[PDB]
Design a protein around this motif. Structure first.
Motif, PDB file in Angstrom:
ATOM      1  N   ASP A  90       0.815  -1.215   0.000  1.00 50.08           N
ATOM      2  CA  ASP A  90       0.000   0.000   0.000  1.00 50.08           C
ATOM      3  C   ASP A  90       0.848   1.265   0.000  1.00 50.08           C
ATOM      4  OD1 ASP A  90       0.635  -0.596   2.753  1.00 50.08           O
ATOM      5  OD2 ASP A  90      -0.962   0.756   3.404  1.00 50.08           O
ATOM      6  N   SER A  91       1.890   1.321   0.854  1.00 51.40           N
ATOM      7  CA  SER A  91       2.795   2.469   0.964  1.00 51.40           C
ATOM      8  C   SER A  91       3.666   2.618  -0.292  1.00 51.40           C
ATOM      9  CB  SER A  91       3.628   2.396   2.243  1.00 51.40           C
ATOM     10  OG  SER A  91       4.503   1.281   2.274  1.00 51.40           O
ATOM     11  N   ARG A  94       1.362   4.113  -2.981  1.00 53.04           N
ATOM     12  CA  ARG A  94       1.038   5.514  -2.668  1.00 53.04           C
ATOM     13  C   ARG A  94       2.199   6.389  -3.122  1.00 53.04           C
ATOM     14  NH1 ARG A  94      -1.780   3.379   1.935  1.00 53.04           N
ATOM     15  NH2 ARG A  94       0.107   3.429   3.225  1.00 53.04           N
ATOM     16  N   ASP A  97       2.442   6.477  -7.108  1.00 49.61           N
ATOM     17  CA  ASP A  97       1.078   6.735  -7.566  1.00 49.61           C
ATOM     18  C   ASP A  97       1.028   6.970  -9.082  1.00 49.61           C
ATOM     19  OD1 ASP A  97      -1.709   7.209  -7.484  1.00 49.61           O
ATOM     20  OD2 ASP A  97      -1.560   9.111  -6.397  1.00 49.61           O
ATOM     21  N   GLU A 194      -7.380  -1.873  -3.066  1.00 48.45           N
ATOM     22  CA  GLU A 194      -6.205  -1.130  -2.574  1.00 48.45           C
ATOM     23  C   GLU A 194      -5.112  -1.063  -3.647  1.00 48.45           C
ATOM     24  OE1 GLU A 194      -5.658  -3.585   1.240  1.00 48.45           O
ATOM     25  OE2 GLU A 194      -5.151  -1.513   1.801  1.00 48.45           O
ATOM     26  N   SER A 197      -6.324   1.210  -6.815  1.00 49.10           N
ATOM     27  CA  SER A 197      -6.439   2.615  -6.408  1.00 49.10           C
ATOM     28  C   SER A 197      -5.098   3.204  -5.900  1.00 49.10           C
ATOM     29  CB  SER A 197      -7.508   2.756  -5.332  1.00 49.10           C
ATOM     30  OG  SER A 197      -7.099   2.089  -4.150  1.00 49.10           O
ATOM     31  N   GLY A 199      -2.931   2.340  -3.357  1.00 47.65           N
ATOM     32  CA  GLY A 199      -2.812   2.482  -1.912  1.00 47.65           C
ATOM     33  C   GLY A 199      -3.836   3.369  -1.231  1.00 47.65           C
ATOM     34  N   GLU A 200      -5.032   3.552  -1.841  1.00 47.93           N
ATOM     35  CA  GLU A 200      -6.084   4.354  -1.215  1.00 47.93           C
ATOM     36  C   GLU A 200      -6.635   3.569  -0.025  1.00 47.93           C
ATOM     37  OE1 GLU A 200      -7.909   7.892  -1.883  1.00 47.93           O
ATOM     38  OE2 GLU A 200      -7.824   7.032   0.147  1.00 47.93           O
ATOM     39  N   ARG A 201      -7.012   4.282   1.049  1.00 49.29           N
ATOM     40  CA  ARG A 201      -7.528   3.668   2.251  1.00 49.29           C
ATOM     41  C   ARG A 201      -8.908   3.038   1.969  1.00 49.29           C
ATOM     42  NH1 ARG A 201      -9.841   5.155   8.160  1.00 49.29           N
ATOM     43  NH2 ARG A 201      -8.807   3.425   9.248  1.00 49.29           N
TER      44      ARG A 201
END
Length: 270
Positions: A90-91, A94, A97, A194, A197, A199-201
């Motif tokens: 996820d990080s 992000r 991106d 996730e 997107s 790493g969107e929450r």
């Protein structure tokens, strides 16, 4: 298993349950110096910390974090695993991106699904499948990690719990503590959202109660920007209220393989 004289600890990379997680070196005789992740350390917590190494040792798959060994007879007690140069998924997404194509992200999810197909085959329920618990190496290969909440499951095989990630957990697992591969299939659906997107929450800044309320209303997460309809449809299948309506992990791997076989079906977006 591993003698401390061959282990060297470097910077702290994460915060585990029983302690720190660090980067480091492992120079065993007859082999070159390799990059490792060192996990460090209540008497019952010592059994629970070493149980994770016990589980990991039983696994052999390209999408499951490989165990190098353990520092048993010495202090501190350490668990050594392969190092994942890019850390949490996820990080990583992000930070990068919009830096990967659909086929690259599908390769990532195909990797996660194969690792999860392996876990179900081994009669294990993860219960903590999230992008933050998926690790990335230099070549962008995704691996399942953190087998702390992982449990060994004929008939209807369920693990009933007594620390639950609300927005990644299936309804029947929150409501009745019923953990099965079908509740892991739900979690995978969230991981897919996730990944697509970047790493969107999951469910944005919605509180845990708002998430539980949204799922009861029959609301399902929308397709992330530029996400192929076929990948979102696969997410909706994982998010079926009825655990028995969700696809099994071999069915998830085959659906992803069909999309790799026909890259024109990924061009179809809403």
């Amino acid at each position: 298993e591993i003698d401390v004289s061959y282990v060297k600890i470097e910077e702290v990379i994460g915060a585990g349950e029983f302690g720190e997680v660090c980067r480091g070196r492992l120079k065993a005789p007859g082999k070159k110096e390799s990059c490792v992740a060192i996990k460090t350390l209540t008497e019952r917590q010592r059994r629970e910390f070493l149980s994770e190494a016990s589980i990991m040792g039983q696994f052999e798959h390209p999408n499951i974090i490989r165990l190098e060994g353990v520092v048993t007879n010495s202090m501190p007690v350490m668990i050594l695993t392969e190092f994942m140069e890019n850390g949490a998924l996820d990080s990583f997404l992000r930070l990068n991106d919009g830096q990967f194509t659909v086929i690259q992200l599908v390769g990532m999810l195909r990797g996660i699904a194969s690792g999860m197909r392996y876990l179900a085959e081994m009669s294990y329920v993860h219960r903590d499948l999230a992008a933050r618990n998926i690790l990335v190496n230099s070549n962008l290969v995704c691996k399942v990690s953190d087998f702390g909440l992982s449990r060994f499951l004929s008939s209807d095989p369920t693990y009933t719990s007594s620390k639950i990630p609300i927005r990644w957990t299936a309804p029947e697992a929150i409501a009745f503590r019923k953990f099965t591969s079908a509740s892991d299939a739900w979690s995978y659906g969230i991981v897919m959202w996730e990944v697509m997107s970047f790493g969107e929450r999951p469910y944005w800044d919605m509180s845990n109660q708002d998430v539980i309320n949204a799922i009861e209303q029959d609301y399902r997460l929308p397709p992330p920007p530029d996400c192929p309809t076929s990948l979102h449809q696969l997410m909706l299948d994982c998010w079926q209220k009825d655990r028995n309506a969700r696809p099994r992990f071999p069915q998830v791997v085959s659906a992803l393989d069909k999309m790799i076989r026909n890259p024109a079906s990924l061009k179809i977006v809403a």
